[PDB]
């Protein structure tokens, strides 16, 4: 019931974008963006249509 | 240089150590650095004019059962600024805790040291 994926290294000043689109009328999931250790950085947001979850993040490290 | 000291101690489950400044100097730079030496402790440095224990305020945020994780981040930032005069970041490969503060008001101040509310899984 849990899915985790790793991403490549990001240079300073770079952005990040994610999106979830249900297909089989499945309930909207919960998506969040953390680091390797696990410290949270961003949380998903549900818009008015309720058919997509969008997350944006920028790194300064 | 002016006044540098080395402090050592142990941190329990959600318990901190209180240090009280006798008199804050005017036009002075205060540097605080804390690094964990054992365990999975996450450093956190804060200061406050009064001596009220913030364990109850921090415990309420941890006790929050809100599904959305944005509230946990927002509440932690809001409760830190509205109570602590200044605070620094927690953990990290680089400067785990390095806060610079100058208070041009004089008097006795209480610097707080403890942990934060994160996850490691």
JSON list of C-alpha atoms in Angstrom, two decimals, chain A residues 3-30:
[
{"chain": "A", "resi": 3, "resn": "UNK", "atom": "CA", "xyz": [5.19, 3.42, -2.94]},
{"chain": "A", "resi": 4, "resn": "UNK", "atom": "CA", "xyz": [8.56, 5.18, -2.71]},
{"chain": "A", "resi": 5, "resn": "UNK", "atom": "CA", "xyz": [10.85, 6.33, -5.52]},
{"chain": "A", "resi": 6, "resn": "UNK", "atom": "CA", "xyz": [14.30, 7.92, -5.56]},
{"chain": "A", "resi": 7, "resn": "UNK", "atom": "CA", "xyz": [15.36, 10.86, -7.72]},
{"chain": "A", "resi": 8, "resn": "UNK", "atom": "CA", "xyz": [18.67, 12.17, -9.02]},
{"chain": "A", "resi": 9, "resn": "UNK", "atom": "CA", "xyz": [20.75, 14.91, -7.44]},
{"chain": "A", "resi": 10, "resn": "UNK", "atom": "CA", "xyz": [19.50, 18.48, -7.90]},
{"chain": "A", "resi": 11, "resn": "UNK", "atom": "CA", "xyz": [21.79, 21.46, -8.40]},
{"chain": "A", "resi": 12, "resn": "UNK", "atom": "CA", "xyz": [21.16, 24.59, -6.29]},
{"chain": "A", "resi": 13, "resn": "UNK", "atom": "CA", "xyz": [18.45, 26.81, -7.73]},
{"chain": "A", "resi": 14, "resn": "UNK", "atom": "CA", "xyz": [16.61, 23.92, -9.40]},
{"chain": "A", "resi": 15, "resn": "UNK", "atom": "CA", "xyz": [12.89, 23.23, -9.11]},
{"chain": "A", "resi": 16, "resn": "UNK", "atom": "CA", "xyz": [10.77, 20.08, -8.85]},
{"chain": "A", "resi": 17, "resn": "UNK", "atom": "CA", "xyz": [7.26, 19.23, -10.02]},
{"chain": "A", "resi": 18, "resn": "UNK", "atom": "CA", "xyz": [5.00, 16.21, -9.53]},
{"chain": "A", "resi": 19, "resn": "UNK", "atom": "CA", "xyz": [1.46, 15.27, -10.52]},
{"chain": "A", "resi": 20, "resn": "UNK", "atom": "CA", "xyz": [-0.93, 12.38, -9.87]},
{"chain": "A", "resi": 21, "resn": "UNK", "atom": "CA", "xyz": [-3.75, 11.52, -12.29]},
{"chain": "A", "resi": 22, "resn": "UNK", "atom": "CA", "xyz": [-6.19, 8.73, -11.34]},
{"chain": "A", "resi": 23, "resn": "UNK", "atom": "CA", "xyz": [-7.36, 6.44, -14.13]},
{"chain": "A", "resi": 24, "resn": "UNK", "atom": "CA", "xyz": [-9.71, 3.78, -12.78]},
{"chain": "A", "resi": 25, "resn": "UNK", "atom": "CA", "xyz": [-11.76, 6.17, -10.62]},
{"chain": "A", "resi": 26, "resn": "UNK", "atom": "CA", "xyz": [-9.53, 5.30, -7.66]},
{"chain": "A", "resi": 27, "resn": "UNK", "atom": "CA", "xyz": [-9.54, 7.52, -4.55]},
{"chain": "A", "resi": 28, "resn": "UNK", "atom": "CA", "xyz": [-7.02, 10.35, -4.46]},
{"chain": "A", "resi": 29, "resn": "UNK", "atom": "CA", "xyz": [-3.78, 9.31, -2.70]},
{"chain": "A", "resi": 30, "resn": "UNK", "atom": "CA", "xyz": [-1.52, 11.33, -0.39]}
]
